[PDB]
């Protein structure tokens, strides 16, 4: 069982995949190999709740039915800032224009 993810922080988005049996700390090490940030300097969130390093991706709520390639699941990323940590902030994507009238049935 593989889940497809979208790790997001600020204006950055990482596209990667992992198994539901893989832990959150293992997903942090995937972010480590990419962004060169240790997993201890990371805080991963789902929606608004903080995920623990011991839980697996499935136990947090990431299933193959909710994390498909054509519509991956979003994971929040927070980087250690000086003595304390980071408040989650995911800058949204652009807004497409309004539907032209040659498209409304």
């Amino acid at each position: 069982m593989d889940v497809f993810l979208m790790i997001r922080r600020h204006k950055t988005t990482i596209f990667t995949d992992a198994k539901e049996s893989s832990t959150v700390f293992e997903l942090k090490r995937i972010v480590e190999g990419i962004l060169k940030r240790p997993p201890d300097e990371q805080r991963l969130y789902k929606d608004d709740q903080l995920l623990d390093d011991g839980k697996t991706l499935g136990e947090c709520g990431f299933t193959s039915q909710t994390a498909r390639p054509q519509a991956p699941a979003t994971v929040g990323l927070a980087f250690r800032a000086d003595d304390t940590f980071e408040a989650l902030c995911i800058e949204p994507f652009s807004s497409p224009p309004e539907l032209p009238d040659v498209m409304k049935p």
Binding site: P100, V102, M103, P105
Partner: protein, 149 residues
């Protein structure tokens, strides 16, 4: 005389048309003169048991847009002879369209054909909307590929 056509073998062959795609599948049989003939459609996710004959040619398209579909991970399907009373399976699966062709599919369905030019797009893409997936066009292409073989 034609290249792609069904052989009048008159040898019965039991086939299962399984619709493993979200599209409404239109089965297309190529007669003994190479002409494509339409057959009853299949709702999404359904399956039907079909009386066919050995050595015949079958195509499968979207009943609304004639989009190409894969039957057993290829374009053509030839029912072989059965064995041990088992019907030959014909899994009609959706292919991995290119991102462009999938975009062309959505735009064709939303915009009416007489309004393809009123889209603020490149003039080249305007001619890609008017080139609907046509079965007769795919027959000429799938015939030249057998000649190169």
């Amino acid at each position: 005389r034609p290249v792609l056509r069904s052989v009048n073998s008159r040898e019965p062959s039991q086939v299962i048309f399984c619709n493993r795609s979200p599209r409404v599948v239109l089965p297309v049989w190529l007669n003994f003169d190479g002409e494509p003939q339409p057959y009853p459609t299949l709702p999404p996710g359904t399956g039907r048991r079909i009386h066919s004959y050995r050595g015949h040619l079958w195509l499968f398209r979207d009943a609304g847009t004639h989009d190409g579909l894969l039957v057993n991970q290829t374009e053509l399907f030839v029912p072989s002879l059965n064995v041990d009373g088992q019907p030959i399976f014909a899994n009609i699966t959706l292919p991995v369209y290119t991102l462009k062709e999938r975009c062309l599919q959505v735009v064709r369905s939303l915009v009416k054909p007489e309004n393809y030019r009123r889209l603020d797009i490149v003039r080249s893409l305007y001619e890609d909307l008017e080139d609907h997936p046509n079965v007769q066009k795919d027959l000429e292409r799938l015939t030249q590929e057998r000649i190169a073989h």
